[PDB]
């Protein structure tokens, strides 16, 4: 009850929001995916739908406290809207991403954040061959829409996508799912942008 | 009019927002389901659609009062946007759950709240076999998206889902519906989450 | 003009809106339906779509004024967001109702309010036999979602639904529109809840 | 040089929003449609989908100014939501109207507003006969939802609908589109209620 | 961190938002499109669906600063709602445009702004002959919905639509894709409106 309230108030009212990273203050976001289901394949549009949730973590001194001052509270939960979050976007969606889970984050005494939104995404993917044995292959890049390599940097803890909770009776069977950090120097833009490229190879069951 | 008016401003203004449960301040939410219709079965994707309402209960101390001080009010109804509510989510939806009822809760003088969302939900369900006599079986887990079992804990009043008011001319027929409390462990997180598992076994007419 | 200006701000700025009915200060709300069109029938999901508008009447003391402080104004119009509205809900929608009309209500000096939303509703209903001469029957119940008969009392003027602005060239002809008032009981709660059962009998033209 | 700023806070920040048309202070609102396209015709529901521009103009004494006292500024563009707008709806839409253009109005020094929303509308329409040189005719009355003809008065510049920029490759050819101002006033009621009837006669291309 | 926050409150919190351009404060927005996929073609409604980025650039004095006073911060990233943005609109759209990327913009010390919304757009276009060697041609105009030639001017860096990251496996091959500046005049208004005309000639692969 009491202390948390006092802490929450200190962090979000006694002080403004993190403004976002800059060159002189870059930030590293650890990204990782749990693919949960390939829901739909449409072969007339070339669209494929994923339901995954997406682990995001990062650390801000701005979000730091000494637990001893706040009743030995070492971490809390709060509405994502209370804090700043990175603009990690899918680079080839074909519809607005749909949000499947509460937008609630967990802050730790040391300034670090863990946020795990469930989403459903339609992205650009030609499923011709999904019925054959060697299956089909599709990718979607995820990355900061507006922050360059110099401001937001991506990182992963594994390059294996978490298939622990893939829907067992899905219409579609995952042959492999990969997540690799990639750098892209771009057109409009001198500075490189950095993304995580989700590659799934799958087929009909 | 006059007395509730005073009560609502005393509960929700004098104090700052309730910050939700902690490890020191745990909560027990009681979940039940009334399952009213299986609208749709889609076997191209593997998604089934249910209309149910789900009954949530919990008690807060910070919501208590002495009815004598407020002209004998034992309870009032308030918009859910005024009180803390649990982040109970369907672990395997394929679409954002759509709300079918008012977001209004009823708080009672001893700090207990009772909140009954009506929802239409798409979830992961392979319906192969729905067209037979033995029918098919499907489950979706419900539970807190961010609070572990040491912050929020679930509980049912019975494992028998309420089917007494299930639509009589549905294209699908319910053969049984269960709600069973269970505990999960996830890779991301140190501490066990707890969920109520809704299992439905159904067929067409 | 500044004479109605002062009225609105005296009623809507001087402290709060209305907090809602209670066992002690209960409220009558009169309900009537103008069935405007049966737009669609779905025989693969057993869902039917009505366009109708919903006549809602209630009298509040908090909204009362004397037109001598207020340059002889008997009434006025205002965004339904400015004042408390009842939580009347279809008990078997399969979809969140969509809004067809501006959210605006006429208020009268005696406190009495008239709000008329236009709406498309998808509800559970088996259309089997809609093409026979006998036609088909469906019912949907409207009523407060959280207020018991002790807090909200529901009234009708007629038991015939209004078919007078029913669209002449609708796909479906109306054989009888009825609005019967019922009080009934639910598993969650000891008290009577009151609802208006709309029973439409219709066939295709 | 961007001092427009002043005119804006002189107008909208000087008093709460204009509270609508009284009876003593009425309002003439002019109406005009540019019909861009009939998109779809659903012969199984009974809905036609139109895409049009709705031009509306009205005059407000409370939004006028001498250009000479404001850096010689004769008109400005502003968000529709910080000026009052008329509550003109289609009386037979079957889907919430879908907004295709920004909600931004233009205000002229003399108090005139111009607002031209582009919309997609679905309305009740029997298209039996659309597949013949004959064609078919359809109708939608647009009117104020809550206001009488002593509070808001609808008017048209002309009753030839502007078809001069109607899609040349539409599946549906327009024969004619009319917009007539209709007035009705009944015995009991010292109000006239007035609406613009949008009649379109069309066939398949 | 430190400086960046003081910058933002000096640009946004002291003196308000830029009110918009005027006859006396003209502005030139730069437009460029990157076509990503033709996602869908409907030949029974004559609607086609594009997925693209629109790169928008403009320069405001009020957003200019000297980096020396703000710790050599040469530029920064901020939410779209903190700044004024041009109201660039598809003229022949048939569904509300859907946004695919985060509404955030990059601001440079010289007052220059860059903003690149990613969009799925449905628009009028008959795809007859998409499945032939010749292909089919569609066009759509992008422009200010409310700012005339005298207020917002449009300009392209090139008239070639950027196809450098068009989807390798789209159903459709792009034979040509053009973006041109033009001035239009409409019944409504006595002054020029400036648009960029997107012309895509494509065929089935």
TrEMBL record, chains A, B, C, D, E:
Disulfide partners: 125-138, 188-189
Family annotation (CDD domains): LGIC_AChBP
Residue positions binding Mg(2+) 3: 75, 191
Keywords: Calcium, Metal-binding, Receptor, Signal
Binding residue positions for Ca(2+): 164
GO molecular function, one term: extracellular ligand-gated monoatomic ion channel activity
Any one GO cellular component localisation term in the record: membrane
Binding site for Mg(2+) 4: 148, 151
Residues noted as binding Mg(2+) 2 in the record, renumbered to the chain: 75, 151
Residue span(s) of domain Neurotransmitter-gated ion-channel ligand-binding: 16-203
Glycan-carrying positions: 72
Annotated residues for binding of Mg(2+) 5: 151, 191
Residues annotated to bind Mg(2+) 6: 185
The name this protein goes by in its record: Soluble acetylcholine receptor
Lineage: Eukaryota, Metazoa, Spiralia, Lophotrochozoa, Mollusca
């Amino acid at each position: 009850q009491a202390n948390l309230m006092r802490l929450k108030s200190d962090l979000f009212n006694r002080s403004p929001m993190y403004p976002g990273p800059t060159k002189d203050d870059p930030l590293t976001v650890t990204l990782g995916f749990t693919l949960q289901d390939i829901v739909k394949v449409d072969s007339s549009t070339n669209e494929v739908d994923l339901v995954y949730y997406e682990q995001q973590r990062w650390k801000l001194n701005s979000l730091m406290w000494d637990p001893n001052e706040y009743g030995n509270i070492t971490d809390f939960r709060t509405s994502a809207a209370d804090i700043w979050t990175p603009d990690i976007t899918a680079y080839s969606s074909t519809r607005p991403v749909q949000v499947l889970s509460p937008q609630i984050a967990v802050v730790t005494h040391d300034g670090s954040v863990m946020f795990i939104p469930a989403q459903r995404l339609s992205f650009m993917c030609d499923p011709t061959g999904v019925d054959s044995e060697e299956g089909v292959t599709c990718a979607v890049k995820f990355g900061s829409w507006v922050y360059s390599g110099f401001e937001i940097d991506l990182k992963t803890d594994t390059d294996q996508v978490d298939l622990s909770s893939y829907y067992a009776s899905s219409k579609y069977e995952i042959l492999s799912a990969t997540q690799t950090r990639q750098v892209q120097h771009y057109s409009c833009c001198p500075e490189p942008y950095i993304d995580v490229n989700l590659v799934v190879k799958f087929r009909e069951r």
